[PDB]
């Protein structure tokens, strides 16, 4: 019962510490295996590229005040600290879309009022630190017990759908940069090149299909058990290596490659330094802004709390076989304090990444070798350790000095990898199966508890409601009112507790929503 | 059984006629279904393109004496006649590689000795007619009873392997014609074009994968039974239509398309006419060649007999549920007489086509709708009729006036179709399963009669022997001694009946070989 209220100050935190910290030698010792290396290699590429993409976007939005080097430094430091001191070291911290929305809105507001951007960020971070400390000291992390699987499925489905859409849009942009023309006259990024878009499509699809086939090969009957396990563990590194070698063989055509800034330097050395004075560098900071920086701190707190807590709820479900424990108090305090303190040095804030954390958990899941003939395998265990997170964060930080190796890797391979992650993440969602049940004939539905106890037309209404919520949230995100997306999602918690009982019966809701 | 020796002249022929001809109204009536249209559409493209390819090759080899129009006329006429009067109307007649080898060798010999090519062909055809009549009159089509599944499996495996290899070589030649260059300076088929090779690869792979996925969709669990069964039948027409539309959408890039000669005319109107005088046109034909034309007639007879009889043996196996009967005497007489008479008009000879006939049988197989959960579907029936063969032959003959529609179809779609046919044809061979059993561990082998009654190391020696025979036949075929290919295959019939019993026992041979 980690969500019970004790009535003492900092009670949940000491309970989490006493529950988790004794397992520390076990956490260090469980990492001696071959699956950990494959997980590290997969998640390193899964985590590095969004840093580069969002760093480029942030540098475009904030006129070079924050770029790629700042985001890389923040990701590395926060990831290392969270993995070392966290109660759930299987979570991956990183940047996200709502954070970018908040940063661009705050930059516009600061430029409108003739204020320094980084000083406002400093005071916002300090207010956020105060708010997180006050919330944790009041054991306020028990409200998570009101977050039903309704909102969890909605959140996971929306996030994975957006991930897949963005990957496809990135692929499409190549075809507009490099169109297929009749004549290519002979001649600062290259533009209007021949054989560039089609090769990119081929590389992306090849990587995706090789990874998917190698994943299917694990449950087959060919070869020995050990060879099957080893090949199944290393499917994605093998796909990446094969497609990179294939692309390297063709040396006549232009393809875009990974570019990482060289050296540990601030993006604009003339405009700013690594430390931001809290009282002002060029002008004195007005006290009224220092007082009034609380509202953006409240928005950031709501965003971070929602994302981190929903990710921790999804990751630690009972069907996923998590044993060492879960922390709903220590993780929030760690993330809030580190994010608030990051404002002093002009680094962006971070939160727990959902798809990356789910993929990290999946890459360490060990299934039963004694697969029943013609039956889906069941989860045997999950490897719990702290080495993988520290290694991934260290590699992300160290990528600055390894630009030479990273320069040989095309982006279409990573597009295929991201497609694989997005497609795989949607298979652990019950809404996915309840959506597949729409196509099957009414006599073909399986024996799940939501099938026997509910009529079909009363099971499809729940799915329609969830899909309507997902569509409305996507529409809200796409328009100019995206800054209110974290709030609207939290509005689906009253709906399941005040309105759904008025339509459904308690017995139906017990089986459908569980 | 139809393979017994009655002891009377023409006994087998009258037995075949009396067994098969009473079913004629049922043969005409069984064609009223939707599956027949899909089979016609698939096999029409499967049969038309080899006519064009071999017509081009023959026109190259024979210096324009025989080309594409002659091959099309021969295919149409012989197919219509065989389908109308045959005892096994599920066989498809057409040109093949050994026939091309024979024509090239005979042209070289006629050129060396200063003889007319077409008059020699005329006398060869007459001798072939005489030989076939003499062979059928002595009920000599009973030796087929000595052809064990050893030879049948070897033949089928070799033919399908060669088919797949030729498709891949065609794609490679497409790439070599249009290399990937850095600069494409603007300047008789087009050469050195941009975006042509990669688009061809994409079209081929897309067609193959769409067809394969739609074939898998048949045994699925979604939608109604009627929709599933309609979509499963029309998978290949749907693939072709989708990829043709996709290729038509892109109007910037060059792709090669189907080219069919216009009009019913001889390839070289100056050199020859439609009728070849048997006594000589420009010079008198020496009588010594008229006598000595028997040896090439013997070679052609051996080739046609071997190919047709092995194809009929493979098609009419007991596992395929053939009910209306089989023809081993009428088919040989029909093919031999028509081929021999074709020499008078300067048209090439024909034989039964193995992959095309197997594909034609597969396209008309109906499985049980009551598929057991997690079980292989069972063959319910095969639709026997004569309408499909007549329609396919008529369409092949009529493709001369339909060049406008045919000119909008790229060749990469057909490459994907041929890959699908070749891959599908190798799944009905027991050697394929016995070759897959090498990879599996010895404890996962199935309960087939060749697994329980034979030791594991004793059933791999049989597979190694068969594979060695296949490799030796391929090597012999590729070299300059290819004219001896039909003989060497017939040398595998003594091997099973004279040397194999000296190593294996009666029980092992009975279990391994049917």
Residue numbers in the entry:
A (entry chain A), B (entry chain B): 673 to 859, 884 to 1210
Which text from the study accompanies this structure?
Anion exchanger 3 (AE3) is pivotal in regulating intracellular pH across excitable tissues, yet its structural intricacies and functional dynamics remain underexplored compared to other anion exchangers. This study unveils the structural insights into human AE3, including the cryo-electron microscopy structures for AE3 transmembrane domains (TMD) and a chimera combining AE3 N-terminal domain (NTD) with AE2 TMD (hAE3NTD2TMD). Our analyzes reveal a substrate binding site, an NTD-TMD interlock mechanism, and a preference for an outward-facing conformation. Unlike AE2, which has more robust acid-loading capabilities, AE3’s structure, including a less stable inward-facing conformation due to missing key NTD-TMD interactions, contributes to its moderated pH-modulating activity and increased sensitivity to the inhibitor DIDS.
The structure of hAE3 in the presence of HCO3− and HCO3−/DIDS, and without HCO3− supplementation were determined with C2 symmetry, reaching overall resolutions of 2.7 Å, 2.7 Å, and 2.9 Å, respectively. In general, human AE3 adopts a homodimeric state, and each protomer is composed of a transmembrane domain (TMD) and an N-terminal cytoplasmic domain (NTD), the latter remaining unresolved in all three cryo-EM structures. In all three cryo-EM structures, hAE3 TMD consistently adopts an outward-facing conformation, demonstrating a high degree of structural conservation compared to human AE1 and AE2 in their respective outward-facing conformations. In TMDs, the cryo-EM density map was fragmentary for residues 860–883 in the extracellular loop at the dimeric interface and twenty-two residues of the C-terminal loop, and thus left unmodeled. In the AE3 TMD structures, the dimerization of hAE3 is primarily facilitated by hydrophobic interactions between the transmembrane helices TMH6 of the two protomers. Key residues oppositely arranged at the dimeric interface, including L894, I898, F905, and F909, form hydrophobic pairs that contribute significantly to the stability of the dimer. Notably, the contacts between the TMDs of hAE3 protomers are relatively sparse. Attempts to capture AE3 in its inward-facing state, similar to the methods used in resolving the full-length structure of AE227, including varying pHs and anions in cryo-EM sample preparation, did not yield alternative conformations of AE3. The inward-facing state of AE3 is suggested to be relatively unstable and transient, as inferred from the dominance of the outward-facing conformation in EM observations.
